[PDB]
Design a protein around this ligand. Structure first.
Ligand SMILES: [Zn+2]
Lengths: 671, 669
């Protein structure tokens, strides 16, 4: 069945065959609630409570016969070592003997309590849906507090070392957290998990090792959380993303920080021991010791089945196959001598695609420059800037500026009507271009989407890859017309009168920014890619907690780190990155500027430049523009990046193959 | 009519008499839309229109009502283009055209009317009549969003022409719409009621004041009071009338469109803030002080007194009203700080005596009734901001720390703590059943949820003041303490880097005894600094996690102990020194050897590791693990920027106008 269904209508296939009937759900969940109530009446004096685990506990049940557990927290279980007191199977057998005699209300028709080793099991069934609850007894480890505070995991590690160590055997104690991690998530994410489990069951059915579905449930949750936080995604992107992750099984290493952190040294040493292991490494959200991935041999079969389904003609039907961008292994886990491989494999965009968008953008520039003004004698001049014009774009979220210079604009400010006219006519000419030239480009073109107050934007997409670049169109005063100080006196006469944030006129000087980072060694552009990725990973979790300083400040720290540390075309990337995290740690003393375009030679430039150098302790003046002050002194949450850098200095990335630490370069902090 | 309506059912009275009919509104607004469309068809000089007045703000009363609409003629290009009268010629041509230009039904409901300095147009429908003043303006906003350069160009033009403060304010009418459109419906109903009352006062008395001043005052009353989009309208009325009665103090302003950042604007605001009060700066033009003739506020005071004291208000003895200050601390001169603290920040002494008498009854009843079966009784210790003498008039809090023998360690005791708090909840319910009339203060029944802290509040019978207590089971660590107790805490933290102080409540007695018994002058400075912090938190909390309030109480004590250990001092120098220390947040390292000391083998070993922490570090004098001034953890950077802004304040200028210097306090100790 499954492989014959096209990628479109998979949501229908899931609704038609996999998802449980709402009728059976609304009977069984009342059955289970009644069971949970009856086991908690004082009848059963020994229970503190119950918690529900397995596929039922996670709310991921399939239409068929299905997995579940429920855990009884007996009050004589008070320590982790009580998990080893196996004689509680006697207690479970008494619980069975009692429970089977209750059969309360109508439910006597639908229970079937059954004898089993190491305690009983209760099945619950209905016309279609059937649940097979494994019954277990455990210490409620969570009752040591009301949250997974670090002392709980410290007591866990101590208990593991005191008894005979058996990693993950006590994970059952945390079943309450396992519910909390899987509720309040989108319905489509559940439907995707059901589809992935159904495929796994088909693979288990035809192949004749074993792997628990919880590993692929975690993998699917990680795929969604990293790739597409939207609650209305396309399931056919989800499947392709998960199968791409499974194909990477020898790299795969996924973990969550939702219940535990690298803060406590006792947990940090556990995570650093586990994260540095045989990939596929799958740490569960609730127990730092419980590596969920099964026998390595089973992932070989899952690879072969992933290849087989992913290459089928029912997938792979789009010209580029759409999928989310997720890394099999976060940067933190990669050893220091593998950084140069990591950058080349995951961060660099494809060279042929950049050549294609360069060829396309010169066509865009040529078509616009001739057509936008025909009545007026003054033509627009379009200059290309941003992260694709210099060679430092990432494979994801690339950007570009098309700065548009024109004679309508007489000053940096007070010209909104002229800029609106320039944008409107560029929008009209881009529409005419899309009408006339659609098949002459070797890249796909999104039609411009625009509204009167917003910036123009359009995107160029590969025809054979997922990569894309987004351009935005920015009218600017042609200040430049290295520049002589009579141009900078124009900016200075705006700011000299008051304290203000800098740099809103940055786009006027885009050529000096591009020419500052371009022509530098490719090794340094790759280090700039690495630092921009590290910053992107910081923003992913610190943005809820503050406004981080702008990325260009760390691009400038990366260049200052190279120029001061070692001005050589080839170097160890791990020492460069370690030095950048050193400079970010030293944020308390940041005095950086470059006398490339502006110097103390002029009477007003010197007067202004000697002022900004005393504005605030952190100061990183844009080499294109003295008012730029992009390392803003007192406004931005530098502290958060300094705390995160101080955390990252523990990373595997900064340990050599011998295991000894990698030192920073000796860079001055004031310059 | 109005004065006979009780405070309850004012919402009914507003719905019954004041609010316009929706059946009428749904014609007039389409009439105005059609007029605005016709005026924007090239009428080739009209770049656009914006609607001002009571219609523009969406505050129209049922009857005849005020409005304007502004025409942005394309030849108007600088502020001084307001001054050339020829706009009346252009208006008279626009009149001549627009009187002939009519469409569909609308000829039955327009009435264009000749007027001096340009025409006017009326629009009327069943039970309604809008009158529009028609004006010409340079659309100053077209320059940028109200960016600093716009107000710099404004001030330059104002000085270049024959200066006329507020005369260019018509240019900003689009911002005046943007400030009023989004706000909650009941705030509109309150504004309608306040305007109807003002019209009744204008009717019987026989100066004048424009309603925009009282509309701004009502918006400020709501924005400073309850931010809630649902409220009792009679609290709104009572707090607005209380603000009007304070007319000689009143000074209200907004930072929504302009800031003290740009020196050209800062000098305007500092000039305006120090003016005849009631000072009412409008949200959109820093020069447009909206308050009318000073004489009119005398009449408004007398009418506020008359209505507020009526038997239809003032019916509930603890008459509820939102606590809003007539004048923000920033506006008060330095030599008036000692008066400001005493007038607005100190709670009433008799109320504190009453809650002290009541809480000793609570403690006695709980201590005897809770464990009757067990031999071990609970011990209840009172702590927090009311036990030391540093509570504010608003948002006071206190801890009832409960010590018991069930608790054998700082951690892993949740069931015992749940039992203790559950039975305290039961005994507080029994107390409320038995003793409700023996207290001289009102008691809220405890409101509780199984995982949450238990809490209850004591309220005055005769004032709005209140105190909130919460009940906190704690390990009886103390049982000055000898180091064998601190070795217990140290053996938890020594093994790892962690945030500190989660066990702070165990040492509450050492915290209270540190701030208590200090001079009352220093407790009033602590009140002032806690108010400054509360005002910083009011606007910076959306932007980051501010450092905890207890850190600034310790900076205030360190500032006094180092600056001048004398029972009386200038409060303005103390506050200036606290803002100095907050500016030098990079260097704190502030601690006190009052309880712990280096005279031990483990405490010294831990404390020399605590001293070797982030440069900004403040150690709770009660507890070496307290470390209440965290480093990167907190958003100190923001308070150090706000302090640098506050150093311009009138509070730090003497009566001669010279600046007040800080005390010479060391930053490392
Ligand atoms: Zn912050």
């Amino acid at each position: 069945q499954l492989s014959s269904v096209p990628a479109q209508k998979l949501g229908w296939f899931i609704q038609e065959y996999l998802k449980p009937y709402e009728e059976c759900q609304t009977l069984i969940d009342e059955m289970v609630n009644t069971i949970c109530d009856v086991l908690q009446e004082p009848q059963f004096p020994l229970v503190q409570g119950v918690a529900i685990g397995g596929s039922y506990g996670r709310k991921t049940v399939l239409r068929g016969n299905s997995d579940g557990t429920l855990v009884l927290f007996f009050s004589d279980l008070k320590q982790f070592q009580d998990q080893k007191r196996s004689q509680r199977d006697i207690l479970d057998k008494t619980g069975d003997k009692l429970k089977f005699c209750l059969f309360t209300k109508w439910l006597k028709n639908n229970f079937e309590i059954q004898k089993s080793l190491d305690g009983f099991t209760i099945q619950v069934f209905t016309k279609n849906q059937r649940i097979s609850f494994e019954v277990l007894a455990a210490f409620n480890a969570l009752s040591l507090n009301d949250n997974p505070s670090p002392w709980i995991y410290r007591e866990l590690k101590r208990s593991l070392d005191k008894t005979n160590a058996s990693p993950g055997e006590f994970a059952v104690c945390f079943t309450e957290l396992q519910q909390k991690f899987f509720d309040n998530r989108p319905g489509k994410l559940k439907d995707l998990i059901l589809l992935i489990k159904h495929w796994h069951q088909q693979c288990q059915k035809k192949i004749k090792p074993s792997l628990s579905p919880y590993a692929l449930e975690l993998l699917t949750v990680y795929a969604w959380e990293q790739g597409c936080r939207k609650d209305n995604f396309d399931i056919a992107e989800g499947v392709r993303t998960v199968l791409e992750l499974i194909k990477c099984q020898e790299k795969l290493c996924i973990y969550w920080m939702v219940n535990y952190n690298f803060e406590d040294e006792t947990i940090r040493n556990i995570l650093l021991h586990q994260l540095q292991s045989a990939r596929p490494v799958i740490l569960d959200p609730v127990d730092p010791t419980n590596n969920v991935s099964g026998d390595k041999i089973c992932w070989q079969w899952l690879k072969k089945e992933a290849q087989t389904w992913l290459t089928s003609p029912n997938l792979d039907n789009e010209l580029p196959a759409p999928s989310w961008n997720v890394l099999p292994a976060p940067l933190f886990t990669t050893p220091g001598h593998l950084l140069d491989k990591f950058i080349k494999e995951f961060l660099q965009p494809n060279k042929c695609f950049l050549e294609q968008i360069d060829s396309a953008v010169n066509i865009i520039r040529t078509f616009l420059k001739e057509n936008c003004f025909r009545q007026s004698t003054a033509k627009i001049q379009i200059v290309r800037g941003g992260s694709t014009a210099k060679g430092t774009a990432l494979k994801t979220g690339s950007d570009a500026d098309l700065v548009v210079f024109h004679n309508s604009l007489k000053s940096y400010t007070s010209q909104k009507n002229e800029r609106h006219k320039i944008v409107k006519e560029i929008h009209e000419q881009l529409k005419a271009f899309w009408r006339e030239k659609e098949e002459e480009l070797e890249v796909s073109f999104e039609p411009p989407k625009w509204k009167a107050p917003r910036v123009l934007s359009f995107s160029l997409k590969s025809k054979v890859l997922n990569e894309s670049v987004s351009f935005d169109v920015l009218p600017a005063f042609n200040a430049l017309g290295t520049p002589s100080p009579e141009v900078y006196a124009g900016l200075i006469d705006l700011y000299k009168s008051s304290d203000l944030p800098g740099g809103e006129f940055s786009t006027c000087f885009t050529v000096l920014q591009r020419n500052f980072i371009r022509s530098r060694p490719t090794k340094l552009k790759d280090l700039i890619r690495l630092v921009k990725h590290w910053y992107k990973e910081c923003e992913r979790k610190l943005k809820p907690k503050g406004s981080l300083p702008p990325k260009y400040a760390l691009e400038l720290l990366t260049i200052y780190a190279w120029e001061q540390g070692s001005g050589v075309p080839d170097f160890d990337t791990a020492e460069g990155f370690r030095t950048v995290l050193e400079l970010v740690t030293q944020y308390q003393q940041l005095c950086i500027f470059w006398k490339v375009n502006y110097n103390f030679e002029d009477e007003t430039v010197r007067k202004f430049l000697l002022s900004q150098l005393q504005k605030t302790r952190p100061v990183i003046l844009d080499p294109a523009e003295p008012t730029g002050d992009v390392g803003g002194g007192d406004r931005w949450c530098w502290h958060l990046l300094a705390k995160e850098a101080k955390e990252w200095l523990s990373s595997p990335c900064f340990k050599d193959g011998t295991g000894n630490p990698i030192p920073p370069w000796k860079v001055p902090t004031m310059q």
